[PDB]
C-alpha cells in the first residue's frame with residue numbers, strides 16, 4: 001500500500017470514531033514515530049486553531065487536502081452550520097480525505113472536491129452556490145499560491161476581511177506569493193513563525209487579510 005493508506009488505517013485502528021481530536025493525535029503519532037508526511041502538523045496546527053477561533057468563519061476554502069489532517073483540524077472548530085470546501089487534485093488522496101472525515105464524523109461539514117483548484121475555483125459561485133469566502137487555507141503546490149489568490153479575486157470570491165492563511169511560506173517556501181501579499185495595499189499581512197511538521201526545521205504561516213480593491 002501507500003503511506004497515505006497506512007496513515008488512514010492507523011487512524012481507524014488507533015482513534016475513536018467520531019472524535020476529531022483523537023484522529024489528529026493518531027496522525028501526529030504515526031508521523032512522528034513511523035513515517036513523516038506533509039500534514040500541517042501540531043505546531044502549525046495550533047496556530048491554525050487560534051486563527052479559526054478568532055474569526056469563526058462560516059465558509060472556509062482549503063486548497064490541498066492531502067489526507068484530511070487540516071480539514072479535520074479546521075472543521076472540528078467550526079460552528080454549527082458552518083462549512084469547509086476542500087480541493088484535492090489527487091484522486092487517491094481525495095478518497096483518503098473523505099474516509100478520514102467520515103471516520104472523524106465531520107462529513108456533514110466538509111465537501112471534498114476532487115479536481116484542480118484553477119478549474120474548480122471558477123465554478124464555486126454557480127455550481128457550489130458560494131457568494132464570498134470567509135477564509136482560505138493555502139496548502140497545495142507552492143507555485144500555485146499566487147496564481148490562485150489572483151484567480152479568487154478575479155472570480156469575486158474575496159470580500160473585505162477574507163482571511164488567507166498560507167502554509168509553508170518558509171519551507172518549501174512560496175516566495176512570489178509572500179512578496180506579493182506583503183507588497184500589496186490590498187492585504188494586511190502577519191507572519192507566524194513555527195516549525196515544519198514533525199521536524200526541528202523553522203517554517204511559518206502567513207496570514208493575509210484582504211482589504212478590497
Ligand SMILES: Cn1ncc2cc([C@H](O)c3cccc(CNC(=O)c4cc(-c5ccc(F)cc5)cc(O)c4O)c3)ccc21
Pocket residue numbers: 038039040063064065066087088089090115116117118139140141142144167168171172196197
Ligand atoms: C492545483 N491543485 N488543486 C488542488 C491540489 C492539491 C494538491 C495536493 O494536495 C498536493 C500534492 C503534492 C504536494 C502538495 C503541496 N504540499 C507540499 O508540497 C508540501 C511539502 C512539504 C515539504 C517540506 C519539506 C520537505 F523536505 C518536503 C516536503 C511540506 C508541506 O507542508 C507541504 O504542504 C499538494 C496539489 C495541487 C493541487
Ligand SMILES: [Cl-]
Pocket residue numbers: 038039040041065066067068069070071
Ligand atoms: Cl494537512
Ligand SMILES: [Cl-]
Pocket residue numbers: 040041042043044196197198199
Ligand atoms: Cl508538529
Ligand SMILES: [Mg+2]
Pocket residue numbers: 038039040139167168
Ligand atoms: Mg503544507
